[PDB]
């Protein structure tokens, strides 16, 4: 699961 934030 990749980073969904900035």
């Amino acid at each position, epitope marked *: 699961n990749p980073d*969904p*934030n*900035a």
Partner: antibody, heavy 122, light 107 residues
């Protein structure tokens, strides 16, 4: 402090639609990915959908692909969930959940809303 | 998908006990396991992430271990406020919770 407030729950006739909202405050809403997670009395915690901070990417659980749609308003700071073709399996409490990511932890949940009940009945 | 199963479904102990909840995965997920605690009527709360990393502010009696397929949550010295429900979560491919474990007061 962080505050997530769900609204829009209620009774839906099978096959009809419904939209849920989640008012975020106390942080920069535009920088965090957001989740929807639901809970059934006898099925447990079931992840529904995730949307990116900028809304670029979006993924759904298989049980809702084609029926549900997760959107986002980075100005009114509100998360949305459009629910079409509601089944009885969809009856549950729907939680708003902010995404937490770190290099060691990965994508997770940290701040949740109070939940809102959706009852698919006739 | 990846399935998550916790054992046992219901735990019976007294205040001060040391109890362990075990979470098994349907396929190897390395150390991508978190542990959440849900109190009645309230939302889940993060306690452990990455199998064994304690979340900030969580008391030290909570503890987690495991790698691959089997994972354990341990509470050394149960407190009165701990007799609730505990879920394990995988965060390798998407997210899957266990069924939950109610910790019950033995009488």
């Amino acid at each position: 402090q962080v505050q997530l407030v769900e609204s829009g729950g209620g009774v839906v006739q099978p096959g009809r639609s419904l939209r849920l909202s989640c008012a975020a405050s106390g942080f920069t809403f535009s920088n965090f990915g957001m989740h929807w997670v639901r809970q059934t009395p006898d099925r447990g915690l079931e992840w529904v959908a995730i949307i990116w901070f900028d809304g670029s990417n979006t993924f759904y659980a298989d049980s809702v692909k084609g029926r549900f749609t997760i959107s986002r308003d980075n100005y009114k700071n509100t998360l949305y969930l459009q629910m079409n073709s509601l089944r009885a399996e969809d009856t549950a409490v729907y939680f708003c959940a902010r995404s937490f990511y770190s290099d060691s932890a990965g994508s997770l949940f940290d701040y949740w809303g109070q939940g809102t009940l959706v009852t698919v009945s006739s | 998908d990846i399935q998550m199963t916790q054992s046992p479904s219901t735990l019976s102990a007294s205040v001060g006990d040391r109890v362990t909840i075990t979470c098994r995965a349907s396929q190897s997920i390395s150390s991508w396991v978190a542990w959440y605690q849900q109190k009645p009527g309230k939302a889940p709360k993060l306690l452990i992430y990455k199998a064994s990393d304690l979340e900030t502010g969580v008391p030290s009696r909570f503890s987690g271990s495991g790698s691959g397929t089997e994972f354990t949550l341990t509470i050394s010295g149960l407190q009165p406020d701990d007799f609730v429900t505990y879920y394990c979560l995988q965060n390798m491919r998407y997210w899957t919770f266990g069924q939950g474990t109610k910790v019950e007061i033995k009488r």
